[PDB]
Amino acid sequence: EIRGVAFKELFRFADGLDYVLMGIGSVGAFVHGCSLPLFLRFFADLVNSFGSNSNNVEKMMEEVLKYALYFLVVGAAIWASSWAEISCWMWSGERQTTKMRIKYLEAALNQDIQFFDTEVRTSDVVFAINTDAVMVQDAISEKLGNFIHYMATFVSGFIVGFTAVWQLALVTLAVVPLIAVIGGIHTTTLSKLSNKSQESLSQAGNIVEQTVVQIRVVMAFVGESRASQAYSSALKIAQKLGYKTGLAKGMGLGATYFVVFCCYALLLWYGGYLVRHHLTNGGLAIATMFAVMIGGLALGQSAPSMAAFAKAKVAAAKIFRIIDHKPTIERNSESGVELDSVTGLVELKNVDFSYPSRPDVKILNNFCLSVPAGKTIALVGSSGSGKSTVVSLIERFYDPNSGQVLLDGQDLKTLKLRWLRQQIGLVSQEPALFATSIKENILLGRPDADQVEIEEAARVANAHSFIIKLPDGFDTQVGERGLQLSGGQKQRIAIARAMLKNPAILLLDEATSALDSESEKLVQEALDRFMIGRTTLIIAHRLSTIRKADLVAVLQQGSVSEIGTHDELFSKGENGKLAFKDQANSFWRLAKMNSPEWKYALLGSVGSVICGSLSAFFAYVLSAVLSVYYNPDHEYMIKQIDKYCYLLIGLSSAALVFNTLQHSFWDIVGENLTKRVREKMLSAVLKNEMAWFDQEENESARIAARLALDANNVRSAIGDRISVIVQNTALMLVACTAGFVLQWRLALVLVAVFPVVVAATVLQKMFMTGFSGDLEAAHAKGTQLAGEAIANVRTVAAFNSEAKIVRLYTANLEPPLKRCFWKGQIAGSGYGVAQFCLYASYALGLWYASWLVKHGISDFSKTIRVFMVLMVSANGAAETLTLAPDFIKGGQAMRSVFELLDRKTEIEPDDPDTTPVPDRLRGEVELKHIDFSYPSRPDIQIFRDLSLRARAGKTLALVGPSGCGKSSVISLIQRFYEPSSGRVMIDGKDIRKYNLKAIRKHIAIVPQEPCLFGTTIYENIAYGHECATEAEIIQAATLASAHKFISALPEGYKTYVGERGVQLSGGQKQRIAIARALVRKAEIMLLDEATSALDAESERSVQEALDQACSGRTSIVVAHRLSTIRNAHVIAVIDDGKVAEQGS
Ligand SMILES: Nc1ncnc2c1ncn2[C@@H]1O[C@H](COP(=O)(O)OP(=O)(O)NP(=O)(O)O)[C@@H](O)[C@H]1O
Ligand SMILES: Nc1ncnc2c1ncn2[C@@H]1O[C@H](COP(=O)(O)OP(=O)(O)NP(=O)(O)O)[C@@H](O)[C@H]1O
């Protein structure tokens, strides 16, 4: 594929309206970006007029009113600009993306079939559908507007700073790289530590996933405690990594604060020096500092836009590669050579063909079907022969490279390729129902049909009664959630589609796994005896279909050299309000669980409060310094500025130390809690019935994924997020008290407009994040329909329904387009209103301060201090409200955690109060009057009044047929399942009233699937007995005729084994499992299909090994072949849950 396209190529699908929208959005973004430095300049001018005219109250009042009106104007401009930018950019991006998706799907469906074999795969095409969102609905939708906005902010801030005071602007410009470098180092270290911690968490998740997968053996052989120990060790490694990550984050933030405070101290001293020499005034100095800092931050904030631009260039290069490719069928489908009377004579002629994917091999050979016109052919040959290949050749999916295939004496290469597919009606292995309605699914076979025609096609051919008995009635949306799998009924629908097409020659490929739904009724309906020409390719083990066709024309080896009418069945065969109180109780319970380290939290909280206070003090200092700038006494101003700079240096050191302290302690408690929670979740999971594991929702991978997610999110919400809330509350209190002390009433007016500022700042944070949600989730219906169409491209092209699919795609994509337009309008209007109210609040507060000064109630210094302090308070409160949704999510996750932990188990693995057991049992087992319905199928009851009996030390060899009991017995003898009314007697004792684990220490399991653990075979053998050492390993496979091959391995015992290890043979791993069972040294032995997948010598050796093992101990054996089990005391037979002859 191309490396990338030009940035200007992203706007290929932009029309005039899109150009107008982009122009308006660019203008709005530029004005919105430039507004903030203009606000800083106007604030500086207001402060100058407010502090430089203490003697002249009239002039200062007039100028303060003037600049408050300027603030209102800036607020209105921000409102208009933000509205225009957000709405126009979102809507134009959505429109261009929708057009691009429509044309991409059209081009992909118009492509030739072989294009999906040699060129990009189907999975690549659906991935392109999915990633089109993050490409175009992201780069040109909001990232471009953000880039323009941030360039405007950076340029305007630099211009304002260098036009107000150029010396201070240069100093701040020198300052900015220091903070940039500190932030970059902090982010790099944090990302590295996060990667390491994620790797450790992935290892722990793998451990829990394997435990849940092999819970079959993890419970049978006690050792779920060992799984808990392994999980604890992995979590301890992850906990050390988390401690390192938290310490790194704390040091990074502390260094950032230290550098910021020291640099601002130097800047304030230099500003005082400049004010002394009458080069400037205090307001312009502060505005210059803030404007240059804002410009630097804006320049920093445009990097994600560039990253999105690069990713979009790559993905758009891929999409344009797919779009611009010219299909092969376009020149194949040429001027009208359609006939006027089809007879149904398909002659394959001498043609051979090879797939372009693997041209070396010739799948097709020298043969010709020569389908008789008006008569049915039914070819049955091999499983890997060109049956589906010749089917595709008939429909001209692939152009033959040798010879030619012709219809009614006319070459297929010369036909319409549209009319041709109109004659042939195809039935495939997969019905391939689309996301649209059932009636639309029927209609896409023939677009020029109405409801009566659909009803007659469904009724006369096949049936339609199943459609009526549907929740949605006559018309139903099958989709992916509206309806579920209907089995052969889905196939039924396909047949109906084939019956909406005009009656002609048909290609009916397969009806496998349809039961009676669409085999007998399929051959009865669909005019399998009527019409002209058919090709029934179904094998179905020769389900009487051969007699239907006049000729068989077998396809052995890939040829029809054997053809005619006969009874030769052997056709060769070469191949084949929500509950907040519950949430609060959950927090109380979790914190009670987190008691053993409450002390840590307190110390963290202490750091928390300090940090909050420090922030407040910083604000105060700035305001104080600003006030000191407007003082005629030069020496007094020098002394005050020096004092404030020294205090700021001290504050920087304290901020570094205490910020590191708070982050370290809160991350410590957070990591410890999330670890304790994970251990508790695993311990509760491993103490559940197998039926609980049977639960579909309790999938091994899902069980692991759910655990990880709930653990991490609750951890974050309770540990990292809280520190923020506490420090922000500290800031609020100190800021509030300082304001009402320096100047009350003004602070009261400020706290009155507090919610307005909080809302405006939280909307600013949301704007920084982005005002468009999950774009992939917005186009879910469209993307799943497109994926279904692309995966089934052969069926789409067979029915000539590309245009119908494209128009359905447009119909599915329109509602998201309208929703995006309205969402953009609402978001822009709300953001603009919030910003306008914010600036109105600023103007009102400043004007009230000026009025208070005029009336002699207060002074410039106190009013300015209260103002700045309260504004930083509002910023902190807005940050807290921004972080609150994470607390909501954490509450949901911890509710899930607590409902999992509080779940009770009916079969408790350990019973502290139970009957004691002798060290050595007797070995007798009595399964008396047992019966139960497997939890998977409660409707299907298994076993009726079974009376199985195994004597002390004797061998039982129950066999049965496949699927009738067998394993179920060993799933009940050892309490994997609960009989409805059964009795299990062991050593003259019922097992229900017993400790369970105590006998399961004396039971050995060798299931059908030879499960293996970890990476070394030695530990796999040792799993049977936790104190195996090496002598029992001699008593292991060493003494079970399974030592030669393991010694032949390069590493011997410590040989890499497992899913990621060496894939051993079935017999070798089976005797590994046998060795594990011997190491268990169980008094009661349970064999389970030990002679199923072994070679002759391996089967023999396993036979003597098991015969030696069973000596003197009761054993239950199941095996299909009776020759191995004839040398047993008793043999039992079961069938359909009933008890057959058992004595012999
Ligand atoms: N695009 C392809 N490229 C390469 N090999 C393919 C391709 N499609 C199918 N094959 C293989 O070609 C061989 C011939 O089988 P084919 O006639 O394609 O289907 P089939 O096995 O007859 N299907 P079915 O009738 O359902 O049992 C098989 O090994 C296929 O897996
Ligand atoms: N994991 C399972 N989920 C659902 N049903 C099950 C499961 N395991 C066993 N059954 C049912 O238990 C009954 C008896 O199956 P069973 O004979 O134990 O199977 P098997 O061990 O796979 N047989 P075989 O392959 O001949 O050794 C059948 O109704 C099965 O469908």
Ligand SMILES: [Mg+2]
């Ligand atoms: Mg086929």
Ligand SMILES: [Mg+2]
């Ligand atoms: Mg089995």
